[PDB]
Amino acid sequence: PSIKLQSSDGEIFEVDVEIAKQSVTIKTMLEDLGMDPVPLPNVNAAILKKVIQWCTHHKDIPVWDQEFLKVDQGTLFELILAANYLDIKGLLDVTCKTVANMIKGKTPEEIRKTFNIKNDFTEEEEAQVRKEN
Amino acid sequence: YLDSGIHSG
Amino acid sequence: SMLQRDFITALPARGLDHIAENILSYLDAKSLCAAELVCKEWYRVTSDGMLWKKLIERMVRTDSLWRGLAERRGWGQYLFPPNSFYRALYPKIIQDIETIESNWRCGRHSLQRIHCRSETSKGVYCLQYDDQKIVSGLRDNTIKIWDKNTLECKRILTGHTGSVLCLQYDERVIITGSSDSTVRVWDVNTGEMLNTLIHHCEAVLHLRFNNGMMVTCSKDRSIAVWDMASPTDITLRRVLVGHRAAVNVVDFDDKYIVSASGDRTIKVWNTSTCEFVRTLNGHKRGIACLQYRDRLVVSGSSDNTIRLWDIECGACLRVLEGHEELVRCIRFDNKRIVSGAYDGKIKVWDLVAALDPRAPAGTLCLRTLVEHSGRVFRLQFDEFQIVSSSHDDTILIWDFLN
Missing domain, CATH: 2.130.10.10 (YVTN repeat-like/Quinoprotein amine dehydrogenase)
Structure with a gap:
């Protein structure tokens, strides 16, 4: 059977119940609350379609997930928020691992230039933090 | 010329 | 869709400290030290998140050498003490492993x-x-x-x-x-x-x-x-x-x-x-x-x-x-x-x-x-x-x- 998911915009998506149950939140709203359709006021239509695609594909980090997260950092942040809101452990873990890979193996200046970060350290503060490494 | 733990042939 | 985003700052600002901590927990020692030096908020996330204690705990859970060092040296009793303690304990463990390899x-x-x-x-x-x-x-x-x-x-x-x-x-x-x-x-x-x-x-x-x-x-x-x-x-x-x-x-x-x-x-x-x-x-x-x-x-x-x-x-x-x-x-x-x-x-x-x-x-x-x-x-x-x-x-x- 299929269930209708309602995004924050109002757009409705018909998704198989097995795929929708991959989200612990939607599964709780279906089983314990008995809600049809399932409103998702914290996920817009675009992020919802992206997450539905990811869940359909997943009925380590594979190459498909690497090509799937080839988006801007804002979209990755929205995907993290949506995976946390819908309690999708796999999507949350792969997105957090992607962020970590973006962090790993880089100098402080390189990480700043990567994520657009300003160095708010006092010279004394930065020297003290460096001395403890 | 071998211990009782191993053997040959 | 913003081009850039500061996950380690944005997530704690939105009550989601655990997600930023789970992100940082994947780092190695050098990457965690680098993250400590990105900005004051990243350092705060690492410190209040006990990222060094969590790193040592993961090393113990995954490495038998770290397990044995925790069980023998005695610092394994603190696992499962501030964050600076673990931050200073990690290089001592690295030096101990180096000395054991040299032995x-x-x-x-x-x-x-x-x-x-x-x-x-x-x-x-x-x-x-x-x-x-x-x-x-x-x-x-x-x-x-x-x-x-x-x-x-x-x-x-x-x-x-x-x-x-x-x-x-x-x-x-x-x-x-x-x-x-x-x-x-x-x-x-x-x-x-x-x-x-x-x-x-x-x-x-x-x-x-x-x-x-x-x-x-x-x-x-x-x-x-x-x-x-x-x-x-x-x-x-x-x-x-x-x-x-x-x-x-x-x-x-x-x-x-x-x-x-x-x-x-x-x-x-x-x-x-x-x-x-x-x-x-x-x-x-x-x-x-x-x-x-x-x-x-x-x-x-x-x-x-x-x-x-x-x-x-x-x-x-x-x-x-x-x-x-x-x-x-x-x-x-x-x-x-x-x-x-x-x-x-x-x-x-x-x-x-x-x-x-x-x-x-x-x-x-x-x-x-x-x-x-x-x-x-x-x-x-x-x-x-x-x-x-x-x-x-x-x-x-x-x-x-x-």
């Missing part, structure tokens, strides 16, 4: 010698130890259980009418093979002889058991696979023939059963169906010892050589020359190979270098330890220490931790 490489170690004081026929054929005890099979037909700490003889088991050649114990029972052609199962706690298996026509030379089944091999050129529903209910499942001389050692896992015999061949059988799979040839003389795990098979032979093979394709990955005598016992872990020869010497080789086909042969043997006056029959080691027993009726504990 293994340079032969720097301390020694404990246990004179078994065997009354008549001296010799210790087999052993197995843990953090609490050392169980050994002697040539006087007895099984001596010594204390790991006080070195005193805690128990003596009698029952075999021949030399106890091989043994293995778990958290439940001990199982021993002897020259009397029998396989005896004893209680690991009280020492009572629970069961006896009469099957092999000659000396049981080696045995192995795990997850409910056992394999034995005998001088009668045969292997026997037994199903163990209980320490007293042991049923013979299959009998494997094919070797043309005495089977000196046998080892197995979920995939294959590996046997080595004086016929200069290693035989790989299927574990589930007990069907012969393949024969590894190469040793110019018979094979006296073997260990098999994952895909790696390591075997010491009478040609004074050690051979490393892949279990699936049967190719010989490496030949190690160095022992001036027969390689009687051999063991390996995830880093190094420890072997013992008939001349009393023990050799420590680099396993990663040996598996690398680009390393020269001369650099493969790392150390040669000489404290035995007789044939080294059996050895077992780990990240910190080696435990060996020899024909000279002694059991040596080589501790490289200091």
